[PDB]
């Protein structure tokens, strides 16, 4: 089983992020284009239609640590959101509450995490949660 080392995997994800995938409702890229460690990423999720997230752009911070992708990345919303599994005061995504993270596989990627969060925004338990005002962000 040939494992692709972290940095070469992240270069692959950088190229895929630049090319974009699907309908463009999720996107990702490096937070700092001079970050040779490839650690800090910006994620974007367009809130899905017919949910209380609709017509909102969500920005996220995704951190790929030294063990990525054997281990999942850390994820936090910058844009305020009320959603199960997201700390409603800090924006931190609780890995134990988001299946893609809790059951992480090394075949997953930043794309997959963002797609999962977007899919979960359509879940019955999330789609009708009343939201904070648009454009608000957490501190720090």
């Amino acid at each position: 089983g040939v494992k692709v080392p972290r940095n070469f995997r992240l270069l692959e994800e950088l190229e895929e992020g630049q090319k974009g995938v699907g309908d463009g409702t999720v996107s990702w890229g490096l937070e700092d284009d001079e970050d040779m460690t490839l650690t800090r990423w910006t994620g974007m999720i367009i809130g899905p239609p017919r949910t209380n997230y609709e017509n909102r752009i969500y920005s996220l911070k995704v951190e790929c640590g030294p063990k990525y992708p054997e281990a999942p990345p850390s994820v936090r919303f910058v844009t305020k959101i009320n959603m199960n599994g997201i700390n409603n005061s800090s924006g931190m995504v609780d890995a134990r509450s988001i299946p893609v993270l809790a059951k992480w596989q090394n075949s997953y990627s930043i794309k997959v995490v963002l797609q999962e969060l977007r899919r979960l925004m359509m879940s019955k338990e999330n789609m009708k949660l009343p939201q904070p005002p648009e454009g608000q962000t957490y501190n720090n």
Partner: protein, 149 residues
């Protein structure tokens, strides 16, 4: 159950007969991943510096090119801000007849003779073309700042 003979061969010859000015050592977890240090070549503005590079041999090697990247910041028209190297034999002109050693040699030579004329050179190329003296001094400055420890 293990690596192809060619990889065993290239790995072992790299550690037995290293390229002058280049150290190349295996990763402690991944037998296809190597940690390389290239000394700045004699008479270049990188001279005296040591530059970390990583090298990976993908599943399809040698049909597929080895993957290489600088992990030390370097000011050079053919190495970008993330350490990616523009070298034809890492893409266009790779063939199974080439080997890891050819790559490391080519990279050393690239540091010795930067090519700001390359169509795909980064934004540093303009400086190298129009004020080469200043660009070379900046390359030396970055060697002092990033490549001496």
């Amino acid at each position: 159950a293990g690596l192809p003979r060619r990889i065993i061969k290239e790995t072992q010859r790299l550690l037995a007969e290293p390229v002058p000015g280049i150290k190349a050592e295996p990763d402690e977890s991944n037998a296809r991943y190597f940690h390389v240090v290239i000394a700045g070549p004699q008479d270049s503005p990188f001279e005296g510096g040591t530059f970390k590079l990583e090298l990976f041999l993908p599943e399809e090697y040698p049909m597929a090119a080895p993957k290489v990247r600088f992990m030390t910041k370097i000011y050079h028209p053919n190495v970008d801000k993330l350490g990616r190297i523009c070298l034809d034999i890492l893409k266009d002109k790779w063939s199974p007849a080439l080997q890891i050693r050819t790559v490391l040699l080519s990279i050393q030579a690239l540091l010795s003779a930067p090519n700001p004329d390359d169509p795909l050179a980064n934004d540093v190329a303009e400086q190298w073309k129009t004020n080469e003296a200043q660009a070379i001094e900046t390359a030396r400055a970055w060697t002092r700042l990033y490549a001496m420890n």
